[PDB]
Every structure is written in structure tokens, then in C-alpha cells.
């Protein structure tokens, strides 16, 4: 044949699998790691945020970040050879670019990698399910690196591909989108957080209900890689929590499954939520309160008390965070309590 | 404060007075939590992915198992045999005892650091701080991407607890 | 008026129902607030 | 308290409609033995 030769080859074992997928996974995924890396080490991000984004500039690990395109570009893919940059790898490196790059090349790495999860999966006679679970991030990364930005003004307001530069991404939401108070995001932490426990527990819950089937102080070797033998008494399980927490994870297909759900699910609920933030559809609102916030100048809930923090986060950062607006806030206009 | 919106409060404030987000500990915290939440879906993923035979298509595949089974329901070999392969082969677990263990300790260890993070800044050993730490020749200051962090931080510092603060320094 | 074969029964056990209910009772508890604005 | 008007039919129906589904599907099955 002619195809199958390409197939036959690239498809069989050779340590680091490389498959029909790899063709797009490996290249995109590589560039991507590089894309972010080069920036942090050598590329500046000054011409977009007037902010230093490279070791070379003096930034540290927690400082370095691969900018994000000035609010002058908007959503233009900002092409290396596009009208804006015109294949001028220094200007193109200056107008940020690497972003759309890292992000788009990256966006594939995922598509690509998940595929690989399928390819290797359909080849090894298993349920792809892993590949499914992986939507969990695609949805996030899609919404949070493409959708949200695409919904707002410019690629600018999009994540930052930084360590701290990304923390900014938080606050900025809390401060403007007041995300913290958005149902959807909530399940987002309900799942991650909820799942982590689920993980840390099944992991340990298992370890302890381990049948001494080795000899001595090394229950790590006493396990049989070879054959079927429930290593953790499922019976010593239920009869444990059933009495300590009131409930029993009686079965392992569901246990070892419900663990798939928890996260992946929440993530989606996050990806939805943020989709909201894309079109500024946010949960800041809470009328019932604010309407009665008008009168009764003496009634106060945390909500408001909190909501106020936000209102400060705006007034102070906006001017320097959003430079392209040349904001100007005189000494007076800034909100402050009596004291500082 | 015991309540939903309360936590949010306890939080936003903190960032402001401790820059917690820039704290090496909380990191190792968000580290595991994120991990565990990823592993919790990983280990849960694989098992169900190499589940084994016992059902029709009408029947619920989940039914294939009885409490007090003597042999596990999954085909571990055909699992590692997959996952291992999916990038590296050796960055995988055949040692079920080890794996289930990795699940335990990761979340449980990071969370600790975190628990310590708060407990660390409890006596004011706040997160890092690089304000004005990057400058040019003349001294004209070049904002670090952390200076924004800090900018949004002041917005927080200023407002929190307006009226009481009867002095220049939030020494508490 | 000849019976179609595909008439398989339906399943939701004593427990799954507890979860199904715990699932709703919760969101209900969560969104209620936002459903009041 | 000035709140939304559908609070009840919204939140409420949200509970009783899906819940009633599960309820049905259970007693529909726990009655295979005619028990229930």
C-alpha cells in the first residue's frame, strides 16, 4: 500500500507514541510551549501594556508573561504576515502577536491531544471516556481564551499567559464582573474543589482498606501487577463510612466513575458562566437588595459590603490596567474610607 | 464569616492585606486542589475506561459488579497499557497501591501548605511583593505585571472597612 | 396494531433517586436566590 | 423586600417538576414486584 505504510509506521509503539493525531498535536503543542516560553525569556510586552514581560527585561518567574494584544487590534488574529505586522518578526513580536499564536496553536494542541486520547484508545480496546472527560479543559480554554475575549472589546482583556499577569485576570473579574458571586462559577468551584476531596479521599480511603498481601513494611510492592485480586476490601469500606459518615460507596464502577463526573461537569458550568462574561452578562446584579440599598442607609449585608470592595478595585486599577483609555482620575474622585 | 457571601468577603480583603495570591504557599495549595480535581477525574476516567465486560446495551453497564466482589472490576493492565502509552509509557502507574496513594497525598499535601499559607500570613508573612521592583536607567519605573496585581490591590485596601480605620496604617 | 419489540422497561433505583433528589433540591436551593433577583 | 415575582413558580416548579419525574421513575420500578 501507500497510506497504510504511513499508518503502519507512525502507528506502532516506539515509546513516544506518534499518531494520525500527533501530526497536529506535536507541532501545535510544541510551538505553543515554545510560544509562551520565548516570550517570558526574551519578548517584551511593553508596546501593549507599557509593562515589562521578560526575564531579559528583568521580570521574574511570577512576573514574566506573554502580554496580550493592545486594544488597538481588537480580535484581529494579528498575523505574522498580516496587514498589521507584515512578517516583521520583531514588530510582530512587538505588537504582541505571540499571543494569538500561543493561543491558536495551542487551541489545537488540545483538539489534537484529545484526538490522540481517542486514537490510542480505539487502538487499545478501551472506552474513550478519558477523551470525553478532557472536554473539561477544552470548554474552559475555549471560552476563557477565545470566547470571552471574542465577546469583549479586544484580545487584550483576554487572559494573560502569565503567573501574576493571570492573577490579574482574577481580581479584574471579581472587581468588574464580580464573578465570585456568579452561580455558574460556583459549581465551577463546587466541582474542582468537590472533586479534589473526592480524589484525596478515594486515594487514601483505598490505601487503608488494603489487604496485607505482602511481607513486612512495604505494602507498595505486595501488589500484583499480574492478576485480578481486589487489593482494597470493598467490604471493609462501606461498613466504615456507613458508620463514620453515614454513607457507603458500594460499587467501584460508579465510584471510579462519579470521580470522572464531578470535575468535568463543574468546569463546564464554569465555561458557561464565563461565556456570560463574554457579553458582559454577569451576576453583579441582586436587585432585591440594591433597591432597598437606596433607602435604609443603615441596612448592610456582606453582599453590598463586598460589592463595595469591587467598586474600589475599579477606580484604582482601570487607569493603569486599561492604558489605551488614558484614564485620568484626580486625587479627589478616588473612593476611600476615613483613614487611608 | 460563616455564610456564603461572607467567605467572598474574608477573601477579597485578605488578598489586599496579604497579597495571598502571590504567596508561594497558596500556590502549592491551588496546586494540588486543581490537581486532585484533575486526578479525581483522571483515575475515575481510566477505571471506567477499562471497566470490563458484564452487560447488554439496554442494561446499565454500571450494574456489572456486586458488593463484596473478590476481584476488581477493571482491567488494570489494559489501562496502564493505554495511559502509559498516551505520552511516555513510564509516567504511568501499574502499582494500583501507589496510584490510589498518589491521589491521597497530592490533594492532602498541597491543601496543607495552603492551610499553612493562611496560618503563615496569620502573623503577617504575606505573599511576595514586587512593586517598583523593576526599573530602568534614569529610574523611571517600569510596571511589573504584578504592579497591576497591586494596583487592583489598593482598590481593595482603601475601601474595606471604611469607617473604623482611624489612622494611616492598616496595622490590623 | 402489532407490538414493537423495543419495549425495554425503565430503571431508577432506591438510591439513584436519592441522588436525583439531592441534585435538584440543591440547585433549587442555590438558584432560588437568583430566581428572586 | 422587593423581589422578582416568579420567585415562587420559578424556584418552586423547579423543584417539584423534575423531582416528580424521579419520584415517578422510582415507584414505577419499585412496583415491578407489585410491591409499593
Amino acid at each position: 500500500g501507500w497510506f497504510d505504510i504511513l499508518d503502519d509506521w507512525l502507528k506502532r509503539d516506539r515509546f513516544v507514541f506518534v499518531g494520525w493525531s500527533g501530526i497536529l498535536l506535536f507541532p501545535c503543542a510544541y510551538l505553543a510551549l515554545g510560544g509562551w516560553l520565548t516570550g517570558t525569556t526574551f519578548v517584551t510586552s511593553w508596546y501593549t501594556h507599557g509593562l515589562a514581560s521578560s526575564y531579559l527585561e528583568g521580570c521574574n518567574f511570577l512576573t514574566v508573561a506573554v502580554s496580550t494584544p493592545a486594544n488597538s487590534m481588537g480580535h484581529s488574529l494579528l498575523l505574522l504576515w498580516g496587514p498589521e505586522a507584515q512578517g516583521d518578526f520583531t514588530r510582530w513580536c512587538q505588537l504582541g502577536g505571540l499571543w494569538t499564536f500561543i493561543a491558536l496553536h495551542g487551541a489545537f494542541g488540545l483538539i489534537g491531544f484529545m484526538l490522540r486520547q481517542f486514537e490510542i484508545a480505539r487502538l487499545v480496546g478501551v472506552r474513550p471516556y478519558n477523551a470525553i472527560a478532557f472536554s473539561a479543559p477544552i470548554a474552559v480554554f475555549v471560552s476563557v481564551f477565545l470566547i470571552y475575549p471574542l465577546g469583549q472589546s479586544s484580545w487584550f482583556f483576554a487572559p494573560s499567559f502569565g503567573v501574576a499577569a493571570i492573577f490579574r485576570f482574577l481580581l479584574f473579574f471579581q472587581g468588574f464582573h464580580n464573578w465570585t458571586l456568579n452561580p455558574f462559577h460556583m459549581m465551577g468551584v463546587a466541582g474542582v474543589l468537590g472533586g479534589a476531596l473526592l480524589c484525596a479521599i478515594h486515594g487514601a480511603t483505598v490505601e487503608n482498606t488494603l489487604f496485607q498481601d505482602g511481607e513486612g513494611a512495604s505494602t507498595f510492592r505486595a501488589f500484583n501487577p499480574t492478576q485480578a485480586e481486589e487489593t482494597y476490601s470493598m467490604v471493609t469500606a462501606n461498613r466504615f463510612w456507613s458508620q463514620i459518615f453515614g454513607i457507603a460507596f458500594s460499587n467501584k464502577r460508579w465510584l471510579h466513575f462519579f470521580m470522572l463526573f464531578v470535575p468535568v461537569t463543574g468546569l463546564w458550568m464554569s465555561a458557561i458562566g464565563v461565556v456570560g462574561l463574554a457579553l458582559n452578562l454577569r451576576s453583579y446584579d441582586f436587585i432585591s437588595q440594591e433597591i432597598r440599598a437606596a433607602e435604609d442607609p443603615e441596612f448592610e449585608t456582606f453582599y453590598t459590603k463586598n460589592l463595595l470592595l469591587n467598586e474600589g478595585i475599579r477606580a484604582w486599577m482601570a487607569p493603569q490596567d486599561q492604558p489605551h483609555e488614558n484614564f485620568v482620575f484626580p486625587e479627589e474622585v478616588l473612593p476611600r474610607g476615613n483613614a487611608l | 464569616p460563616l455564610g456564603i457571601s461572607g467567605t467572598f468577603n474574608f477573601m477579597i480583603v485578605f488578598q489586599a492585606e496579604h497579597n495571598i495570591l502571590m504567596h508561594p504557599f497558596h500556590q502549592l495549595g491551588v496546586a494540588g486542589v486543581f490537581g486532585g480535581a484533575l486526578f479525581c477525574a483522571m483515575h475515575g476516567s481510566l477505571v471506567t475506561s477499562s471497566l470490563i465486560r458484564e452487560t447488554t446495551e439496554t442494561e446499565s453497564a454500571n450494574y456489572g459488579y456486586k458488593f463484596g466482589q473478590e476481584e476488581e472490576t477493571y482491567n488494570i493492565v489494559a489501562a496502564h497499557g493505554y495511559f502509559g502509552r498516551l505520552i511516555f509509557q513510564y509516567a504511568s502507574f501499574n502499582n494500583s497501591r501507589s496510584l490510589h496513594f498518589f491521589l491521597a497525598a497530592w490533594r492532602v499535601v498541597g491543601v496543607w501548605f495552603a492551610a499553612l499559607g493562611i496560618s503563615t500570613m496569620a502573623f503577617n508573612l504575606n505573599g511576595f511583593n514586587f512593586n517598583h521592583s523593576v526599573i530602568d536607567a534614569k529610574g523611571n519605573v517600569i510596571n511589573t505585571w504584578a504592579d497591576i496585581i497591586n494596583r487592583a490591590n489598593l482598590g481593595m485596601e482603601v475601601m474595606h472597612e471604611r469607617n473604623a480605620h482611624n489612622f494611616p496604617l492598616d496595622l490590623a | 396494531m402489532e407490538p414493537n419489540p423495543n419495549r425495554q422497561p425503565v430503571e431508577l433505583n432506591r438510591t439513584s433517586l436519592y441522588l436525583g433528589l439531592l441534585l435538584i433540591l440543591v440547585l433549587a436551593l442555590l438558584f432560588s436566590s437568583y430566581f428572586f433577583n | 423586600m422587593e423581589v422578582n415575582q416568579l420567585g415562587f413558580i420559578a424556584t418552586a416548579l423547579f423543584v417539584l417538576v423534575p423531582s416528580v419525574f424521579l419520584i415517578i421513575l422510582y415507584v414505577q420500578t419499585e412496583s415491578q414486584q407489585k410491591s409499593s
Binding site: 456507613s242 454513607i247 | 463484596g68 | 436519592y18 439531592l22 440543591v26 432560588s32 | -
Partner: peptide, 30 residues
């Protein structure tokens, strides 16, 4: 009004704890 709606949920749920723990489908060792 709406605060009963909150308390009604809150409660019927504590009772979904009742049943799911005490009238829960038992683990059959076979």
C-alpha cells in the same frame, strides 16, 4: 415569603438525608 422558600428547601433536604441514610438501599455481600 421567599425566606420560607429558602427554609423549605433547606429543610426537605435535611430529610433527604434521613431517607438516604436510614432507608437507603443496603450493600448485599454475595
Amino acid at each position: 415569603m421567599e425566606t420560607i422558600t429558602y427554609v423549605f428547601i433547606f429543610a426537605c433536604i435535611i430529610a433527604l438525608f434521613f431517607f438516604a441514610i436510614f432507608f437507603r438501599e443496603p450493600p448485599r455481600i454475595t
